[PDB]
């Protein structure tokens, strides 16, 4: 039905589905077909040069993306490329050239009669039943954020944080190395990732973290490597996600995940902040860590009652920083788009079907 | 204080500070007779600390200066409240082994635990927050 | 005298969760996975397992009349499993917004709703919403002020009990407008409103569960201080007519109930089931079910929650218990 | 006193090496074994003493197994005895150095540090990997003649062999292929082609190395009596390792193929450097005309990888830079390079003194530097 | 003999206070933390019971729902036993991963402090550990006594073998 073109990974499933159906990463191999694609590029990546066309919201391998979409429409969907419709959404703050190229392709390559290219943040925010609010879209390589109001996102408040999963994994492996072990940066990039999301949990308690790590053993765990060697991890389990809150540790001068969000919130007028405060949510890397909602809520409260004008906690309950924690935050935008595409299907007011396929004039702005 | 603590403010009798002294005087004059008076009234948990410490010291001294020939008699002849109170008193007195010897206290604790039941210690463990 | 040994179950049981016919019991394993067994010649056998959970599952339940199964965990949400006609068990999620993790869950008598032991300062209840597929959420902030540990459902759609962490024993009520169940008046409260409270009975310490006579009255509850208390309320504004607190000499217990109209049985940390009578103007301990009090006793570990037997709503004269090392037993009397 | 000559001790299976820096030959050599036996429970021989007193040594068991320390109670005794009765060294006079097989676990390394630090009350600990210690010994050759920690360490032992590449000093043990074939295979081959002490004496006295047996036989028809005759056995001995099928068909993977797989498993970016220079550890695979044989085998096996890949892919890759360098005396070269590495003035800038331990415990005992 | 009464008392109080149950931290979500180290937890912690038979030895028996602690002060009168028990506890707490129960930094003013959680109580029996605690204490006492008695032999042997050479 529809899909969500992501930088690192990509999903696809039927419209109004209970859960996703297919999941493939944007890592093409190079040797078994001519060029590895998805499973053929991941499971057989040992003897194939992997490649990630989508990166930083841009693309460089046009033929690679073409083959990816062809294989998708052939097997993942099992539907005719022209006898069906789709609705994709690129990352926020993307260029217009990419959207124009995608439209030209969907119009003159597969024969799609009706398509739609919206903003992923808008769909992720609408999936939760809200027309005005904010979203923390911590992408795989860049954490983009932009508010929403009146069914339109404010371009002035659009931004992107340098922190991402790559820097997190890099700091994790660096800490595992400096802790006593001797690992390589590219020796095993999958075991470290599997162990991070399995044993690491973000916690905004630095005074208690090291105390419990150096005064107790319950924090210690026993992890098994792929070969069989028993590896141990101690205080390096909670320090890994701390790079998001301290960009200066990863070698990038940035306020922080919460400090920057605040600076952007109070940057606009007070008429919108009243509703933006009760819509603090995240969809992506900033909504999958354990203990992240409480941490960001505490940070927001602190920077609220100790930043602008506050001397005593006599009005702490006036401002309510609503931070929703959606369990399906990874597929939030996917479900939003899947549920929205059904309302615009029967509607004949969409100026895309029968117009953005072959009837191209001299104006292609309404897209 | 606010929660998990029944007594909150008992200044009506705490400010007096006379019942404890009267009870300690009769016990001292008498010194299977101590527990009758020394256990008739427990130190009321309040802002008074010197009187409570004095009463605890007096009770410990009375327990030490007691006939240890056949403790089982008094151990079995006592109500649940009395055994619980004496167990709590022994537990609170065994905290400072410098002033007291604590040998008689430990012996009485072991005897009341092995003669009455194996639940008195658990019951006395969950005492008041500041009493 | 009477005993029975089933699958050793080398995992923390903490539950029994029998089925409708009491033939397909479910139990946790300190992991997202779940273990299900089927009847076999003089014992059970592995039948199927469940998945899709993130953190260890804590409590589950199954209403015998409907043959449904509901589960919860410390994952901010709870799941429910339905019986599939093909020969398997379906899985479905319920939309409920909470602030902390859940600890306990209990089904409803008439099979119309359920309660969850949210670890936060609020309790939630869900049900089947008309003209929809998901279950609406719920929360209460006025009556409760701290976390809850145990839960119990009176034989009705009102007066939902709740075991608070503090020494007080709170009690709530859930009367939804869409639910046509009329809130009949009783001794607890006549024409009680949606949100209300009956009385905060100060216990002798902690609270592990609340008892309920087969008739409905004579509320009771136990605690960690090795003591059990009863109550005979006469009005929502009057005090109890008889508040007797009996303190057993053995180790404390948990998850009590009302075996007979007068007799009460329960177990817990102590390695022996207790047996005592009950009266409105008297109380005394008779003896224990064990007849041998590495170890001489049968159960050489901590006893887990205790569930009743089918029997009859008026009297059962039987029950089942287990421990942290499995070895479920089906006592009698 | 922070300036005296350090000490290097590379203790391992079989023979254990120990001596001082700024030298070329070992000061003591003997097998790692002790002749363990009311009171006076400390009388047990060590080394050659135990080898001779085996008559009453009462089951002289080995204290080391598979390189990893398994019996610390006996390892500490062996260490202190070899240090006091066979070295006559003062621990509170200079720095120390311990040995650790490749991928030594933090638990064992910290245990060794704590048992060698608090027991003798020394001042200064240092542990490294055998790969770097062996690679530092090849600096004497005219090929590198400088500090360049880039290559591979192929440790060929008497019982078994292994390989552990290093990426700019950091040994990456993510992809390694060990060769169980060792001197025992050639010993059994020689013993079978003549149908312990005599076998070793015959194997350590005459061993030729030929390009191919087809030419060795042709050159033989166109020889020595010691100890009792010789022949094509000297030519067939070395090939037992080159072509495992000759000695043992179990591990058909030959040495060139294993090296190619190990160097191609890692990313090509670092493999281009790893495949430049390689050094062999120990002195087991050191036979007359051996190094050049392996070099020729590798440069012949790389044909189908370079020449064919150039036409298949269509890109001139002038990567003809491989040059293997063999050690002159590697029988005890594990510490030869360690001596040169420790003789640098900056050797003490990456150690831990008593002040860095008395107030830190056994926590900082794993992270080191060059 | 004031040793057996104290041993019986500590055994009984430990068996009575050993009650571990699963509890979720009402402060942070989806992280099971202790109740004696993080935050305050006023309405969960019990009264810290202590038992003592002398002035130089004691044990603080603290209790909680999932953070029960326990510590003992080994008897020490001379510098020999002092440094002996110091080094022993140091080496024992250094490799805390072996037992998975001992701590790394005992509480201030004590020698060694243990730590038990719900998992540790379910992976092993109750009376077994209760008896093992007393057995380990008695064995440590006997080993310290032996070490004190084992040095005299070596000392006299060295003296006799160094003075008899002449």
């Amino acid at each position: 039905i529809v899909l969500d073109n992501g930088t690192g990974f990509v999903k696809v499933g039927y419209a109004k589905d209970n859960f996703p159906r297919f999941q493939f990463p944007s890592i093409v191999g190079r040797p078994i077909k001519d060029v590895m694609v998805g499973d053929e590029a991941e499971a057989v990546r040992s003897l194939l040069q992997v490649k990630y066309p989508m990166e930083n919201g841009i693309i460089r391998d046009f033929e690679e993306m073409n083959q990816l979409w062809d294989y998708t429409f052939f097997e993942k969907l099992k539907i005719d490329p022209r006898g069906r419709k789709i609705l994709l959404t690129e990352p926020p703050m993307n260029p217009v050239a990419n959207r124009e190229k995608m439209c030209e392709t969907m119009f003159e390559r597969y024969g799609f009669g009706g398509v739609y290219v919206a903003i992923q943040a808008v769909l992720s925010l609408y999936a939760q039943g809200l027309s005005s609010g904010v979203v923390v879209d911590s992408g795989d390589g860049v954490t983009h954020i932009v508010p929403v109001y009146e069914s339109v996102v404010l371009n002035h408040l659009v931004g992107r944080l340098d922190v991402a999963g790559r820097d997190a994994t890099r700091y994790l492996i660096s800490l595992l190395l400096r802790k006593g072990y001797a690992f390589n940066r590219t020796a095993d990039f999958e075991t470290v990732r599997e162990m991070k999301e399995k044993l690491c949990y973000v916690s905004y308690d630095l005074e208690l973290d090291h105390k419990l790590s150096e005064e107790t053993t319950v924090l210690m765990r026993n992890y098994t490597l792929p070969d069989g060697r028993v590896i141990k991890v101690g205080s390096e389990r909670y320090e890994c996600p701390e790079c998001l809150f301290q960009p200066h540790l990863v070698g990038s001068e940035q306020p922080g995940l919460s400090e920057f969000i605040f600076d952007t919130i109070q940057a606009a007028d007070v008429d919108i902040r009243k509703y933006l405060y009760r819509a603090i949510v995240l969809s992506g890397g900033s909504s999958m860590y354990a203990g992240l909602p409480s941490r960001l809520e505490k940070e927001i409260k602190q920077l609220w009652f100790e930043r602008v004008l506050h001397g005593d906690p006599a009005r702490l309950p006036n401002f309510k920083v609503k931070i929703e924690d959606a369990p399906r935050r990874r597929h939030a935008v996917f479900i939003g788009g899947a549920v929205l595409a059904d309302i615009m299907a029967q509607n004949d007011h969409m100026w895309v079907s029968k117009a953005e396929w072959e009837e191209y004039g001299v104006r292609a702005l309404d897209k | 204080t606010e929660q998990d603590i029944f007594p909150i403010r008992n200044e009506t009798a705490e400010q007096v500070q006379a019942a404890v002294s009267q009870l300690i005087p009769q016990a001292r004059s008498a010194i299977l007779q101590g527990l009758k008076t020394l256990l008739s009234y427990v130190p009321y948990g309040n802002d008074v600390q010197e009187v409570r410490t004095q009463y605890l010291n007096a009770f410990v001294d009375v327990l030490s200066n007691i006939r240890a020939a056949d403790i089982p008699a008094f151990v079995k002849e006592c109500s649940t409240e009395e055994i619980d109170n004496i167990v709590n008193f022994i537990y609170r007195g065994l905290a400072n082994p410098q002033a007291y010897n604590s040998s008689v206290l430990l012996n009485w604790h072991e005897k009341v635990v092995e003669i009455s039941g194996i639940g008195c210690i658990v019951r006395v463990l969950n005492s008041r927050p500041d009493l | 005298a009477t005993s029975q040994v089933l699958h050793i179950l080398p995992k923390p049981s903490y539950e029994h969760a029998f089925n409708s016919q009491r033939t397909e019991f479910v139990t946790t394993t300190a992991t997202n996975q779940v273990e299900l067994y089927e009847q076999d010649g003089n014992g059970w056998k592995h039948a199927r397992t469940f998945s899709d959970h993130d953190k260890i599952v804590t409590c589950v339940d199954w209403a015998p009349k409907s043959n449904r199964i509901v589960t919860c965990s410390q994952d901010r949400n709870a799941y429910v499993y339905e019986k599939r006609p093909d020969g398997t068990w379906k899985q479905t999620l319920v939309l409920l917004r909470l602030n902390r993790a859940a600890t306990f869950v209990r089904w409803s008598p008439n099979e119309d709703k359920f309660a969850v032991g949210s670890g936060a300062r609020v309790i939630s209840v869900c049900y089947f919403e008309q003209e929809n597929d998901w279950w609406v959420s719920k929360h209460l902030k006025r009556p409760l002020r701290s976390t809850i540990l145990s839960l119990d459902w009176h034989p009705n759609n009102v007066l939902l009990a709740a075991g608070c962490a503090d020494r007080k024993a709170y009690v709530l009520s859930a009367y939804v407008r869409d639910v046509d169940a009329k809130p009949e008046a009783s001794v607890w409260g006549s024409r009680l409103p949606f949100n209300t409270v009956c009385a905060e009975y100060p216990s002798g310490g902690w609270v592990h569960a609340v008892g309920f006579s087969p008739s409905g009255n004579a509320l009771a509850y136990a605690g960690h201080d090795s003591s059990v208390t009863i109550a005979y309320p006469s009005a929502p504004e009057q005090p109890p007519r008889a508040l007797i607190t009996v303190k057993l000499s053995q180790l404390p217990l948990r998850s009590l109930l009302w075996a007979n109209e007068s007799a009460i049985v329960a177990a817990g940390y102590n390695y022996s089931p207790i047996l005592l009578q009950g009266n409105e103007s008297g109380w005394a301990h008779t003896r224990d079910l064990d007849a041998g009090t590495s170890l001489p006793t049968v159960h050489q570990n901590m006893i887990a929650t205790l569930r009743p037997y089918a029997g009859t709503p008026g009297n059962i004269t039987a029950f089942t218990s287990s421990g942290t090392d499995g070895r479920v037993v089906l006592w009698t009397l | 006193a922070s300036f005296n000559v350090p000490i290097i001790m590379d203790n391992g299976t079989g023979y254990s090496k120990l001596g001082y820096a700024g030298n070329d030959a070992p000061s003591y050599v003997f097998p790692t074994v002790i002749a363990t036996r009311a009171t006076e429970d400390l009388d047990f021989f060590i080394g050659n003493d135990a080898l001779k007193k085996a008559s009453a040594g009462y089951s002289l068991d080995y204290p080391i197994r598979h390189g990893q320390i398994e019996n610390w109670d006996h390892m500490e005794r062996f260490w202190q005895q070899s240090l006091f009765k066979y070295l006559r060294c003062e621990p509170e006079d200079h720095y120390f150095l311990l040995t650790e097989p490749p991928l030594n676990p933090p638990e064992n390394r910290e245990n060794t540090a704590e048992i060698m630090f608090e027991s003798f009350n020394c001042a200064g600990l240092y542990i490294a990997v055998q790969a770097v210690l062996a690679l530092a010994a090849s600096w004497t050759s005219s090929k590198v003649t400088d500090r360049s920690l880039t290559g591979t360490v192929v440790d060929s032992g008497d019982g078994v062999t292994h390989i552990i590449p290093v990426a700019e000093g950091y040994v990456i043990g993510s992809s390694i292929k060990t060769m169980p074939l060792a001197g025992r295979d050639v010993t059994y081959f020689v013993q079978s082609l003549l149908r312990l002490k005599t076998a070793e004496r015959i194997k350590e006295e005459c061993c030729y190395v030929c390009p191919d047996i087809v030419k060795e036989f042709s050159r033989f028809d166109r020889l020595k009596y010691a100890s009792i005759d010789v022949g094509f056995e000297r030519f067939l001995a070395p090939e037992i390792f080159f072509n495992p099928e000759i000695a043992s068909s179990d591990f058909l993977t030959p040495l060139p193929e294993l090296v190619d797989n190990v160097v191609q498993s890692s990313p090509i970016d670092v493999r281009k450097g790893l495949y430049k220079n390689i050094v062999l550890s120990g002195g087991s695979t050191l036979f007359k005309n051996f190094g050049n044989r392996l070099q020729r085998d590798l440069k012949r096996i790389v044909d189908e990888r370079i020449h064919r890949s150039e036409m298949l892919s269509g890109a001139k890759s002038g990567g003809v830079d491989v040059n293997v360098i063999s050690h002159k005396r590697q029988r005890n070269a594990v510490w030869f390079g360690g001596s040169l590495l420790a003789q640098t003035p900056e050797f003490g800038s990456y150690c831990h003194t008593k002040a860095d331990y008395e107030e830190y415990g056994a926590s900082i005992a794993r992270r080191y530097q060059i | 003999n004031t040793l057996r009464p104290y041993l019986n008392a500590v055994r009984s109080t430990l068996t009575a206070s050993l009650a571990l149950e699963e509890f979720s931290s009402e402060i942070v979500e989806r992280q099971s933390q202790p109740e004696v180290e993080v935050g305050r937890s006023p309405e969960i912690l019990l009264k810290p019971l202590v038992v003592s038979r002398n002035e130089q030895e004691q044990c603080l028996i603290e209790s909680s729902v999932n953070s029960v602690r326990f510590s003992i002060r080994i008897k020490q009168v001379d510098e020999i036993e002092r440094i002996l028990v110091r080094k022993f506890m140091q080496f024992l707490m250094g490799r805390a991963e072996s037992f998975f129960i001992l701590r790394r930094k005992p509480v201030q003013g004590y020698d060694i402090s243990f730590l038990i959680t719900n998992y540790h109580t379910e992976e092993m029996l109750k009376h077994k550990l209760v008896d093992f605690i007393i057995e380990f204490m008695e064995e440590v006492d006997a080993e310290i006594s032996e070490m004190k008695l084992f040095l005299n032999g070596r000392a006299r042997l060295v003296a006799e073998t160094y003075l008899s050479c002449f």
């Binding site: - | - | - | 082609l193 087809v214 036989f217 042709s218 022949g231 094509f232 067939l236 090939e239 072509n243 000759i246 | -």
Partner: protein, 174 residues
């Protein structure tokens, strides 16, 4: 590898029969092949060296006749060395003759493995040709071995030539 390659067979043209090809060489007895252009290096001489080198080998990639002929020559040389390992010169020559110029028919006899001997059997249209070729080749190889291995002694061959016959091609020695 250390095996003995054929270096004579190809995939262009050859007088093959069943599973092997023809290899013209110089011989005194009757042969099916014709005289070669030059006697600089015959196949019977290279086969002896190939067998002496592969006696201690595992196997060889059978590629048409190139490997079949080499395996046959190695087996014949091993049999000759085992029959005349340490026997008298007269008896050794008698056995060599009785094994080379015997009534041995086309391959495919019982007892011995038919797969290792000759997989594709083609008796018709080449029976006599194959028989005479095998006879001539066996006689030539036996005579060459008896002339080469024989040292300056009174018909005493090299000791190693007879003592290094423990194994065989594909472990076909015991």
């Amino acid at each position: 590898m250390p095996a003995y390659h054929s270096s004579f067979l190809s995939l262009t043209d050859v007088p093959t029969t069943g599973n092997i090809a023809m290899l013209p060489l110089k011989t005194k007895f009757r042969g099916p092949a014709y005289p070669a252009d030059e006697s600089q290096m015959d196949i019977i001489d290279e086969c002896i060296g190939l067998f002496r080198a592969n006696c201690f080998f595992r196997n060889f990639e059978i590629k048409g006749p190139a490997d079949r002929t080499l395996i046959y020559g190695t087996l014949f040389i091993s049999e000759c060395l085992g029959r005349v390992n340490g026997l008298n010169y007269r008896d050794a020559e008698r056995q060599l003759n009785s094994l080379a110029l015997e009534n041995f028919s086309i391959p495919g006899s019982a007892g011995f493995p038919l797969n290792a001997l000759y997989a594709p059997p083609l008796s018709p249209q080449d029976a006599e040709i194959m028989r005479t070729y095998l006879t001539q080749f066996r006689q030539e190889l036996a005579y060459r071995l008896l002339s080469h291995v024989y040292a300056t002694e009174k018909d005493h061959p090299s000791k190693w030539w007879t003592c290094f016959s423990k194994r065989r091609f594909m472990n076909k020695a015991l």
